[PDB]
Design a binder for this molecule. Structure first.
Ligand SMILES: C[C@H]1C=CC2=CCC[C@H](O)[C@@H]2[C@H]1CC[C@H]1C[C@@H](O)CC(=O)O1
Ligand SMILES: C[C@H]1C=CC2=CCC[C@H](O)[C@@H]2[C@H]1CC[C@H]1C[C@@H](O)CC(=O)O1
Ligand SMILES: CC(=O)N[C@H]1[C@H]([C@H](O)[C@H](O)CO)O[C@@](O)(C(=O)O)C[C@@H]1O
Ligand SMILES: CC(=O)N[C@H]1[C@H]([C@H](O)[C@H](O)CO)O[C@@](O)(C(=O)O)C[C@@H]1O
Ligand SMILES: CC(=O)N[C@H]1[C@H]([C@H](O)[C@H](O)CO)O[C@@](O)(C(=O)O)C[C@@H]1O
Ligand SMILES: *[C@@H]1O[C@H](CO)[C@@H](O)[C@H](O)[C@H]1NC(C)=O
Ligand SMILES: *[C@@H]1O[C@H](CO)[C@@H](O)[C@H](O)[C@H]1NC(C)=O
Ligand SMILES: *[C@@H]1O[C@H](CO)[C@@H](O)[C@H](O)[C@H]1NC(C)=O
Lengths: 532, 532, 532
């Protein structure tokens, strides 16, 4: 087999052919194709620039580096979320603005297959594109799968709240990667006219943000947010960000005389220096002691007036923006195992009481943002069922799982619906065999669990039962169908009701059946409590 | 009511209201409006670039930092020159290209008031805009007052004598602020068609230079120089500047292989390194020992072929330019106390003698630039009056003051008059009650004295006598009048004759009246003596 | 009598006049005219850029700095090759993109004399333009002599094989200077339509490369390669260069994560650091210990896709480029002393034997590149002669000279001839009197020996005899006749046949006369042996 060579604006790319069990046409794969100029030196904390064109044939045949992040934390999430047999270790580097392509098309002739661009999660602090192999998806549903990478942590979200460092560089990288798709994907058998953006968690939030940004208008045609939206305050830094900026500057050892001075100084530091600072800050771990409101937050999406002209809560109440089919969905136990574990959540006992509950939730303020004078009312409505200390822990996890993902998600879907745009919702409730051993077997539909079915882990890994194997096939159909027509339906698949007034949504799992009114009670209770 | 918000070209700015005794309408003050991109990193030693526009409302409510300078000397000059009750301490920074705006207009309606841009002095080595509060002048004369800052010392005047580092960055910053005003001052109630530039000392020197530069052509319509002009040699380096550049490069710890190499190296130093380098050169103090003519330079205005195409001495006796009304003035005793006190001039005796005189006057070369063979003739002229060891000390001061301000000022005036453009002269002779304690009472019209009257110190500070209050109301009317018509005269004021052929000028003080032939005698004497 | 002053595109240059022995027309000399912007900071490893225009008159009267290189080796080569009486001490700097002009034309009147641009040699690692004084040649043949410089070693040839650092900066520097000649030379009395480029060794290789470069088409009209062509392997690294980059990267102490990462780290290193890295490398010295092949050669000309689109080998077989009169030549004893000396070749005992030869040959791999399995046949061909162990050393020095210069050189001329363009060859067989003392009198026509005749050492240095003087004059006529008409012939000169199918070449020395089939037998052997 002679390597697939594609011609792109910036030059030619050389890839490799990989065949998948049960498919005639081997999939053409490309790794580490640059879509932007390396954000080094003076390019740090600025919008991504076009990639410099190359003279000969570029070998897109080596997994690219994952943006600088906590290597330990990074590699772990890669392992837990990956869908490939063996996990692929990755190197760090500021030089990370790359994207991988998986095309099943026969490059020998013209092809305009729907394109699906994936934005990985990791709370904007960690993650990589290489973690997800788009082999199965491409072959199984005949779509072009593109996994993109974007600036994380300080490198992609540091903001002085002014024109010296607006922020949201990570998000600008996403929009930059999307343009590349529009100008080149046709060379890989893709249809720049049928691009669908889908991500999980932080990636879900990103898709949520892009669906709102005037900078993305016309860059995609359908969107999927998996367990993550923009109303999810945790990732969106509203209010004056200046204070957090100065805090970072000082930790890195810089004067805070003026914004421009901070930025200039941070541009002076080395990758290693910013990483150490990144770690002293302990952004991914939750601070137990101290004041709930003080415990340093983090850094993420901001309202720069470029990507976002205003907070998401506001924007969504404005039906004058360009709309597109939008699928929003959550898992059964978003806060089941994964997240708590990675945050080192205080759940050693496996039990709880009305007191600790009101105490853990308060300290969990940097996550669920709940006023202390509200703590009780909330703690009661949930943990008031039985007296079982164990039944309590579980309801508490639901409590949180509804605040971060449940309520926000349904709300977003509602508004999008009311906006007059095609909307679909779903609740994934399954337990993949590819779960971690340290995961209690009772936890079903945990954070990220649907990833294995969406990316077809069953056709790359081992031990998947016929049930699981078919659950995956089923899901890819849905996703691919949506990608094709902005409607998940297709012959041979359960019927997926459109999310309208009836609020019909689809429950996916062992038995995939349609239902209605998702987290309706939940949305109600919280819409009020928060209104104080 | 509500804080003032003006929309400029680069975005909206938020100011603050301040009422002043006897004025209904409060003055809208704006602090720290950026008129240039912070000259940091590679931008060091290069022309000023346009400021980047901002997405929301910018708060122009804090005093901006002052450009890097001797923190010690800076605070001292500010306290001595400030027209306000309590001196405002400042921060040092390379990010200092800001300006403050004081408009007395009712921003709720259209207004086109005359505009006066103030350029602070400080030997191009120290100074700040914030030192001068425009609240009084704006309220009392109904004009917009704009105080600007420009790079100082190494940062704004370093020159290799060639294209790798022309120099005059500071003057360019000044020209830059005039362009900002031309494009934005209307949003603050100003009339871009009537901008008057004025400054004292180094600032007066700056105004003079701008009057001779093609770069400032059409950016101002009137000009006033308070005790300082172009011929004021000391601030205008002549000959090869390369040697001084190298002296500076070595002190900072750089190579000196080529001009490009020097500049490339200093560009890499840090603010503190250049600040500590500045402190070592001791530009401010006068060296008492070693050979006089050698004594260390100071950097300043240079003939770069961009701002000045030749020496002021050459440009005046020449080109058919675009002239404008020009007001040039000096004080009664320019070297009476303030300057000598700050240069630590050796006069602890309170007396001098014909011999010591010639000794001092020769060591004072870096200030007067008089050949040693001329000294006796010159020394004799002034000190040859009587034998009093006191009357000598004083006459020696008139000597210095005449060579540095008196004669140069009148020559300039004449040259301007002869060019055929309105010309006015004045001589301020009054001892403000806001003078420093350590200042003998025998001094009148010391350096900087007319500053309290010009910016109405009597209306901010305390204790002004009715006579001092009046002197201020008067001077301001004159300035403002000149700024409106280009003629100081107006009702309720003594007649100020034009500096035409009769060489009439205004003697300002407790008793203001017109006179003729200011310094005529000296100009003559020094023209021959200097002609070897 | 008054300093010459010519106006160039970026400003005025002030030179000096100099008179040679009996010439009435003095020669104007300009030293250090910049033809590009100092390649500092980010400009490192990037194509040369235009120079910044200066404002007044620039004094071109000081030897510019030679580009960073080994100061020991650099001084040494300059001392061995200089044709001036006293050697000129030089300074090192990244700031070195300058050229020197020697024009015999009367600047007061129009003048379009032929232009001869000289590219110095030095293995692309060392060398400087100032070594070569153009006074004699300029006066003696009435042509304008131009000596140019270009980045060396790491600064001028570091390549990552991709767009982040293509390479050949040094060759691009040469092309830039040529463009500078085209736009200015006329101002110096030179005809931009008749520019001849000639260089020695590495400078010879450069001339050969410009001859095949699409970029350089139209920048010259005649070319002379003296002991060095593009086929001279040792200077053109084919294959993947990425490794040598990683090696340099690591030695300089830089991560090797990605090309962009490497390039970015090296740009951050100080000139001094990169020189230390250059010394650690140990390029100019042949390594005896270790694997012959692994013993890294150097780093030089690469196929970037901008200056060269394919290996010289492939390019020559293409008669579809621009063709011009090309003179190519070698010296009787190319490897007779200078080269084996500067590299510390193990030949002290002044003799060799078949075994030590085959073994020596294998170690010299990074010089003549000879598959180990070939050595015996090769060594048996040259050393199969007498049993005289001393003759074997000389014949071994022929073996090498042939593979590095003789053979490659003839093949080029032939290929050029066959492409349909005027070709001329020669063999210099003479021992200049200006040879180092440590050079055996039996070595005649050693590497670089012709330089003394070409640049007329006999008319600047002492000791030359009537015969050497006569030789120099002769050679200078030939070189200038070529520069004039693309034909070395002229009245009063031996006939120099054209290198057509008969393959006539000129033998230069004490007895200069025509001849045929130079190296004919040797090329057949090596072409055949190398066919593997
Ligand atoms: C010790 C010094 C400081 C403060 C003084 C205050 C009042 C009397 C006298 O005035 C002295 C001077 C000495 C005489 C000279 C110093 C010159 O710097 C300015 C002047 O006019 O007087
Ligand atoms: C002892 C060795 C080192 C330095 C010398 C210096 C001057 C005389 C002679 O030159 C010797 C040589 C012996 C002859 C060798 C020198 C090689 O450099 C090439 C050669 O032709 O034979
Ligand atoms: C820097 C490096 O050595 N890695 C590889 C890079 C990748 O493009 C990037 O790392 C992104 O994967 O360049 C190649 O792919 C190429 O163009 O031939 C080969 C090389 O092995
Ligand atoms: C550090 C500081 O005090 N400067 C402040 C500036 C100044 O007013 C000038 O714009 C620039 O110095 O503006 C702010 O106050 C503002 O617009 O919110 C932010 C900043 O903190
Ligand atoms: C660039 C530089 O500063 N170097 C020297 C220059 C040369 O033009 C260049 O070095 C190239 O020769 O010449 C000078 O004397 C000059 O008057 O311009 C200044 C200095 O001595
Ligand atoms: C790129 O891949 C091809 C095919 O596998 C290979 O022949 C070539 O050597 C590679 N080039 C690089 C840049 O290593
Ligand atoms: C500017 O001042 C206003 C007061 O009117 C304040 O509300 C605002 O926070 C200040 N700017 C910022 C964003 O800090
Ligand atoms: C340039 O040359 C002129 C006269 O040739 C000389 O006066 C001047 O000083 C030189 N430039 C320098 C080095 O200052």
């Amino acid at each position: 087999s002679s390597p697939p060579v594609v011609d792109t604006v910036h030059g030619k790319v050389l890839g490799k052919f990989v065949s998948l069990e049960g498919f005639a046409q081997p999939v053409a794969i490309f790794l580490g194709i640059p879509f932007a100029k390396p954000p080094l030196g003076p390019l740090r904390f600025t919008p991504p620039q076009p990639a410099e064109p190359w003279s000969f044939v570029k070998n897109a045949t080596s997994y690219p580096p994952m943006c600088t992040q906590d290597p330990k934390a990074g590699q772990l999430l890669s392992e837990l979320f990956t869908n490939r047999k063996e996990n692929i270790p990755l190197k760090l580097s500021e030089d990370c603005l790359y994207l991988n392509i998986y095309t099943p098309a026969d490059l020998t002739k013209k092809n305009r297959l729907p394109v699906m661009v994936w934005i990985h999660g990791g709370g904007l602090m960690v993650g990589a594109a290489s973690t997800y192999d788009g082999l199965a998806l491409a072959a199984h549903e005949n779509v072009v799968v593109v996994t993109i990478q974007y600036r994380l942590g300080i490198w992609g979200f540091f903001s002085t709240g002014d024109e010296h460092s607006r922020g949201n560089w990570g998000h600008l990288d996403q929009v930059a990667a999307l343009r590349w798709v529009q100008d080149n994907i046709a060379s890989f058998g893709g249809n720049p006219g049928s691009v669908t953006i889908f991500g999980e968690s932080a990636g879900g939030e990103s898709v949520s943000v892009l669906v709102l940004s005037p900078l993305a208008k016309n860059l995609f045609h359908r969107a999927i947010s998996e367990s993550g939206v923009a109303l999810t305050s945790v990732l969106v830094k509203k209010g004056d960000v200046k204070p957090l900026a100065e805090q970072i500057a000082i930790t890195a050892g810089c004067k805070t005389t003026t914004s421009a001075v901070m930025v200039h100084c941070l541009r002076q530091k080395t990758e290693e220096e910013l990483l150490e600072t990144t770690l002293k800050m302990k952004f991914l771990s939750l601070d137990l002691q101290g004041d709930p409101r003080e415990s340093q937050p983090l850094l993420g999406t901001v309202i720069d007036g470029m990507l976002l002209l205003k907070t998401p809560e506001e924007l969504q109440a404005e039906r004058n923006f360009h709309t597109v089919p939008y699928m929003v969905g959550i898992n059964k136990q978003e806060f089941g195992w994964l997240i708590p574990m990675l945050m080192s959540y205080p759940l050693s006992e496996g039990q709880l009481d009305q007191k600790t509950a009101m105490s853990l939730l308060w300290k969990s303020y940097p996550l669920v943002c709940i006023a202390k004078e509200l703590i009780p009312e909330a703690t009661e409505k949930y943990l008031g069922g039985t007296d079982d200390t164990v039944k309590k822990k579980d309801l508490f996890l639901d409590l949180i799982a509804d605040v971060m993902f449940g309520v926000p998600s349904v709300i977003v879907a509602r508004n999008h619906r009311d906006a007059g745009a095609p909307t679909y919702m779903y609740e994934f409730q399954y337990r993949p065999s590819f779960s971690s051993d340290m995961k209690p077997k009772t936890v079903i539909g945990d954070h990220g669990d649907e990833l294995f079915s969406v990316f077809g882990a069953p056709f790359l890994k081992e031990g998947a039962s016929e049930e699981e194997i078919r659950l995956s096939k089923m899901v890819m159909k849905f996703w691919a169908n949506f990608a094709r027509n902005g409607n998940p339906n297709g012959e041979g698949l359960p019927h997926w009701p459109e999310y309208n007034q009836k609020e019909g949504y689809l429950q996916i799992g062992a038995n995939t059946q349609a239902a209605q009114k998702l987290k309706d009670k939940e949305v109600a209770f919280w819409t009020n409590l928060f209104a104080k």
